Amino acid sequence: HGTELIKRGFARMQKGGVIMDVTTPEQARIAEEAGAVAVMALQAVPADIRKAGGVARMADPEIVQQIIETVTIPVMAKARIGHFVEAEILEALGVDMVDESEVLTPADPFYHIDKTQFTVPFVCGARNLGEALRRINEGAAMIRTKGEAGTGDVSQAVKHMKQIQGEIRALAGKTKEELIMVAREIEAPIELVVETAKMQRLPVVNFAAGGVATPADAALMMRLGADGVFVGSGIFKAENPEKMAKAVVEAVNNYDNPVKLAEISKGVGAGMKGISADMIPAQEALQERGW
Amino acid sequence: HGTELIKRGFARMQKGGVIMDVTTPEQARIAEEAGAVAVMALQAVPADIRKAGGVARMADPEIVQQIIETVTIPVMAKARIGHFVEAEILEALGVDMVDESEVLTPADPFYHIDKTQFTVPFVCGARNLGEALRRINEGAAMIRTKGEAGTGDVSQAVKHMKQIQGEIRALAGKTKEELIMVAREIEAPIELVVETAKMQRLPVVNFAAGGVATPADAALMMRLGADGVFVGSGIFKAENPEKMAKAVVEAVNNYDNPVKLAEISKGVGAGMKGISADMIPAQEALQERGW
Amino acid sequence: HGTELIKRGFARMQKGGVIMDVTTPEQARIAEEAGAVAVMALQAVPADIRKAGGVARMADPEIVQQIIETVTIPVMAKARIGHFVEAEILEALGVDMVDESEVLTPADPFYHIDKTQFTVPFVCGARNLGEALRRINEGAAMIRTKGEAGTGDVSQAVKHMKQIQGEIRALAGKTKEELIMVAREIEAPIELVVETAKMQRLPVVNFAAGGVATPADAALMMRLGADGVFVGSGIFKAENPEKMAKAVVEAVNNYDNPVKLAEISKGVGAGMKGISADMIPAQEALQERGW
Amino acid sequence: HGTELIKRGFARMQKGGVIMDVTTPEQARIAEEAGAVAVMALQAVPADIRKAGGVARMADPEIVQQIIETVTIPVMAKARIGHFVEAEILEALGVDMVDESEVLTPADPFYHIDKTQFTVPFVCGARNLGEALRRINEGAAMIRTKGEAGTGDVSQAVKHMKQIQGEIRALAGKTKEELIMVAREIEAPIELVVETAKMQRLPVVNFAAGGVATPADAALMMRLGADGVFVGSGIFKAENPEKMAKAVVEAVNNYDNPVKLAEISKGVGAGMKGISADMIPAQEALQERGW
């Protein structure tokens, strides 16, 4: 199987980019022209998944094969939580990274995949520091904040990004006898809590996902310490997907220049009509999945 | 960056005036002719925001650019709570004051902007004396009562205005050992609670907002000690926006002359059909935002 | 009045020493010969105060005058909480430092003395970081952990010493927006929480008090980061006060040399028969005083 | 410092023996003649500690020096929980093993010693599998069940011995995905829970302590899987310490021969008058210490 370094060397190439979720070959072609670094083939954007309801599963193998033949950038895919056979079918198709999505219906209500047995690197969700460290223990090669997929509200993504980054800053200065106590409270391996405290960052690349809907929200996450952004319903549910796409990609490249950001936001168009994240009942919140 | 005095010298020029919220260049032209002191460009008046629902964001940069070119009085804008990048884009556009509105959807559920790092002065909401003093600590150059935006009921604005002004009157006569105890109960800096107690007023200009719907309500707030009034849905959701506008502006200039106030109120027209503030559930109350 | 620097320059001379509580001139003479740095005149050691009960007050002015004439090292005294007139009488007698003791019966159930109006430096108790910072705000020139006076159990002193020092280590690495949140939770001035976080120690000298009963416990507190130790009932309620005194003084000077510590502990004698700190009801715990 | 193997090679020499707690040189001489493998010097047997109350501490250094000069078998000692300076003084005296006893008054209510920094091997208590694995993580070179010291009731020791050994038997057959779930429930390192499951025993020597009072109880613990027995108040609080001593030592050597055990128990004498373990309130139970 692929060494952990090489899986933690496919996740580092994605730094400072944008990943756009697409459903058809034409949408995949659009994203590549805008300058994206990867695409995420799925049957329907997270906004539609809330609307349609029912049971969501892995995309049809026919679609993921067509997108791959259409773009040159790496292609990712989604699999249900704990469905180690779905992740086997995607890997055989040639995807470069499999995303254990909480958007799709969980298949195993207790366990996640055993990601160390596979070769393709994975990406997993995380709400706090405890969840980030457990996932890396299982072999996750990247982490992305859960947020609230399909709502267009960046309130939840910022909350989870300050929880992960807020805790990692407190670990500085603590003594060994205390870092052992923290590992108990957050229920994380003690080997990682010491590796994190020495580095002051998650030992794997960390992205932002859920609620990114405008060029301003994209550059906000990069100013909180993210290495990139996952943009889904925000672009292709907007007024003009083509214009919004180039704006978001350019926003991440100039997240620290206020003068330029004003230029980008002009003429982009109206964003997706979201849903207030505080309006969603807890039982309906996708973020609650991924124990 | 701009010195606190100059930011606390742009907020003082607005004393004894009216600020009217507008959405289109024509509405901006209307307000200026009525004699207003400033306009607040936004995508939709707070009355529509309740009706439309969804996620509300910063206005389109194209609109704020058009209003600025249309009026000579200063132009303000709104930004979401905690979205320090949106406040960066507005400042680059040339607005003279950015309003951290609780009407829009909060972007950060824990923190507000760090307003001391910017040059354009800010304005922030407040329900009591504790909230007013914390905001000024962060660099707010003006305070306005939250009220209940979009309801047309002046019950909530009066309540919050007697909470802020009622507390500042109790601080007179107290001894140092006691002013320290108050700062604990209201959770405010002790340096400000002593500056307030010596001045018997908020050290920054204070306006009234939310529920002002008639020339009588406008002059009521000025008789409770306000320095001005923020009028939003009240004017342009009324029967005749043009006539209501001149009446409200004239009401604030004669708030202490009963004979004249009768003359102003004649022929103005029917006010906006409001909503009883006591009918709104707490979870739906915009005033609860702005912790 | 004495400048805060000079009061924070009388507290620094006491670093790396032992302060022994004495009741009679002969006990005061004993402590000086053992090499102590100061004595604390009081009517009865904290062990007797629990036994006798009743109301405890400031020592008789006749006693404090006799001790001062007997020793050359500085003489301290105790005063009740909030009794600003008792602290006035001691200062006139010539004591060099007044100790706002929680052992004595509180006189004011809401407020402490206003220690900035006096010239003699003060010392005050503290259970956590919040209490340490409030006391320094009022003008305290030294801090000592409350512990559980008169029990001979070093369990409580260690607990409070890891609470104060444990919190100061977490403050390293935090950002300004977060140090403001901490100051709210611990209810401390924001100016101090930033001074502490930059220094990684309390800005004033910190001692250990309560439960020190053997040469081992004395060197334990110095190994947790204390600058000294307050030893009360431990020495003069032991089998041989003369031998225990020289041992404790020598323990603090060799707290980091295991070979020597064994030599000191040989032939010292039996320590005071203490009381298990977990056996004391909360209403009877002296540490609960000093809100 | 001593390698973990050598500390886990001083604990293995004690297999299949008896360790007798002694207070005076004569008692130490008695135990050696009976054929014991080690002695545990302390100020008073656990039976007296309950009766005397107060605060219990490390023995006088004079006593531990006298016992060592009297016997040829290794000499152990006790230290309070979390008192890393007391364990330093004993090591300098020449003891071969330091016992972090829960019988003595805890000195640190949150943490135990950091036993990896020392050279002398340690022994620590344990009520279940979770506690046994955490202690070994810190560097414990032996484990002994807590039981209920000083009661003479073998009900509690058997309970804890079936908890530790009962859990280790369930771990057989489980899959990796499940051994990770167990490590969460028992809050133990995942590296040890896999080492235990492969060996089907604690990776360090395990003894029995608390409630052993007769030659029958001694051989009962050895039939439940113990490697030895710690006998304290049982022998020297009995009718005839000399006869009981040889009986208990001989019981452990013939724990599996019913015919011989009858011969040993004849003429031994009356055992210590114990206290029913179910009569002791939880707050008074020594076993509750050692979190």
Author numbering:
A (entry chain B), B (entry chain A), C (entry chain J), D (entry chain I): 11 to 301
Wording from the paper:
Through the cryoID approach, we successfully reconstructed and identified the native Methanosarcina acetivorans pyridoxal 5′-phosphate (PLP) synthase (PdxS) complex directly from cryogenic electron microscopy (cryo-EM) images of fractionated cellular lysate. PLP is the biologically active state of vitamin B6, participating in over 160 crucial enzymatic processes, which include the metabolism of glycogen, amino acids, and lipids. Each monomer adapts a triose phosphate isomerase (TIM) barrel fold that houses the active site for deoxyxylulose 5-phosphate-independent PLP synthesis from D-ribose 5-phosphate (R5P), D-glyceraldehyde 3-phosphate, and an ammonia moiety from glutamine. Like other homologous PLP synthase structures, the M. acetivorans PdxS dodecameric complex consists of two layers of homohexameric rings that stack cylindrically, with an outer diameter of 108 Å and an inner diameter of 42 Å.
Similar classes were noted between negative stain and cryo-EM 2D averaging, and by employing a single-particle analysis approach with the cryoSPARC suite, we reconstructed a cryo-EM map to 3.38 Å with D6 symmetry. We found that the native PdxS complex exists as a homo-dodecamer of PdxS subunits, and the previously proposed supracomplex containing both the synthase (PdxS) and glutaminase (PdxT) was not observed in cellular lysate. Our structure shows that the native PdxS monomer fashions a single 8α/8β TIM-barrel domain, surrounded by seven additional helices to mediate solvent and interface contacts. Monomer tips also interdigitate at the hexamer-hexamer interface, creating altogether three distinct types of lateral contacts that give rise to the dodecamer, here described as AB, AA, and BB. A network of six inter-subunit hydrogen bonds anneal the facets of interface AB together, while two such interactions comprise AA, and another four comprise BB (while each has 1 and 2 unique bonds, respectively, these are doubled due to the inherent twofold symmetry of the “self” interfaces). The first 10 residues lack clear density for modeling, as was similarly observed with the Arabidopsis thaliana Pdx1.2/1.3 pseudoenzyme structures, indicating that this region is relatively flexible when unbound to its glutaminase, PdxT. The M. acetivorans αN helix displays several solvent-exposed hydrophobic residues (I16, G19, F20, M23), with regions of dense negative and positive charge above and below, respectively, which is highly suggestive of a putative binding interface for the glutaminase. In our maps, no instances of PdxT binding were observed, even after extensive 3D classification and examination under a low-density threshold. Based on comparison with previous crystal structures where PdxS was co-crystallized with R5P and various intermediate states, the density is most likely to belong to either bound R5P or an R5P Schiff-base intermediate.
